[PDB]
Write a protein that binds this ligand. Sequence first.
Ligand SMILES: [Zn+2]
Ligand SMILES: [Zn+2]
Ligand SMILES: [Zn+2]
Ligand SMILES: [Zn+2]
Lengths: 125, 125, 119, 125
Amino acid sequence: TASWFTALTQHGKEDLKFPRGQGVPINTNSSPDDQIGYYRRATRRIRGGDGKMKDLSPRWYFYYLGTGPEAGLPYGANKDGIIWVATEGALNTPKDHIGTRNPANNAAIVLQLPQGTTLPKGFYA
Amino acid sequence: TASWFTALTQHGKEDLKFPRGQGVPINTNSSPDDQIGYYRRATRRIRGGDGKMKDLSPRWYFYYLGTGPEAGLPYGANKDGIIWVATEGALNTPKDHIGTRNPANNAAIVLQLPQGTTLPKGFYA
Amino acid sequence: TASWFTALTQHGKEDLKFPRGQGVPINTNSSPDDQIGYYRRATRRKMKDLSPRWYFYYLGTGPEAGLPYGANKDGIIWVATEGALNTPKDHIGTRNPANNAAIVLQLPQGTTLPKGFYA
Amino acid sequence: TASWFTALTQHGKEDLKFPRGQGVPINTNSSPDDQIGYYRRATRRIRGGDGKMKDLSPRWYFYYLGTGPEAGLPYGANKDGIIWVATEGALNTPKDHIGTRNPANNAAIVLQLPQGTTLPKGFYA
Ligand SMILES: [Zn+2]
Ligand SMILES: [Zn+2]
Ligand SMILES: [Zn+2]
Ligand SMILES: [Zn+2]
């Protein structure tokens, strides 16, 4: 139960957003029907080298529709820390056949977006 | 016992098939002699969104000749859920020196095929 | 919790130093605002006096998290890229060796290094 | 305690060898003086799922002169499973300052040789 992909890191103050049709990570081993899901914000509060509590940049992880922590949400569900992406031609059906990644069995895929798609403002990898 | 590579997912009703000479996954850590093996079908059943049991898209896993669940099958042996692939120059000898992957020690390699490889409808790489 | 980057090794007698605008390690997971910090000298030891290693920390992180940019102190040198903000980089912090590997320290093509430094 | 670099895998029958001046892995964070060491053969015998013993391909790991399992050997020491490499200008002095890698702290560097250099016969990565 992990994302198939590495995270997008939020350095800026804006939540992640993509224009309609953009933001689905490249996965050559998946069908055009599969190209739909959400990014989920994950936050960390950690102790620094000075021994004080610190807020790390929020990280956003991609999950295919009907997988991951919000497997039960339908496409477009309005919820804080959840944003939706879909490529033209994707089917609005759960991607049970893809599921989530077992870190014991598989490494994360480095998240890459199609040439032309730019990371939204304040996002780095 | 695991495949060195991630699966090819069967999205359509066509079984995995390659023309003679095609379908061996790219692996820079292998000789021309080594480019031969089989794909093995794995199917799984889960409870769907309706709460009814359903068959997920079959997955096909590549094993080098003389390794994996069918290590004892000779090249070309007719068995359901087994298909054979070999690159030009590959030797019909067991690939003991490559063996199979231990998930505890190694992550799967992302299965890649040469650009232009013929795949049945509903297969992507 | 360690440096995000591998060390610059001092092979010569010259301490690490960079002209203003140079010396911040390349990190694609950082904004132009973030391109500021210090290198800290670490030295190790029949009896051994091994080449000093200099480790990069973002401003307001690591062993000298409490020092302001430009503080004059032995074994600490300061670097900043054009456009960097003089604010602590708490959001980046330091690396947990248990969770993350060090990034190989790389400098932009053309960066000036003292004699006995290589990157 | 590990090699700084990933292994070269011996698929062929020949031991590793490089022409004089070649075979030192690229390491931009080291001096011209540092460009000298040995590769050391490591072998693995494992029992397969068929209950048969399998000799996995020998792996050759690079260590800087005066580091690693043969830290005590001088440059050119004649010993089975040890082969020597040095770049023009390297100094015949122990590289104590480099030492070996702690896998807990650092990932292996992918072993790279200068563009154009081919791996010796029977070696793959
Ligand atoms: Zn930042
Ligand atoms: Zn799919
Ligand atoms: Zn081989
Ligand atoms: Zn050195």
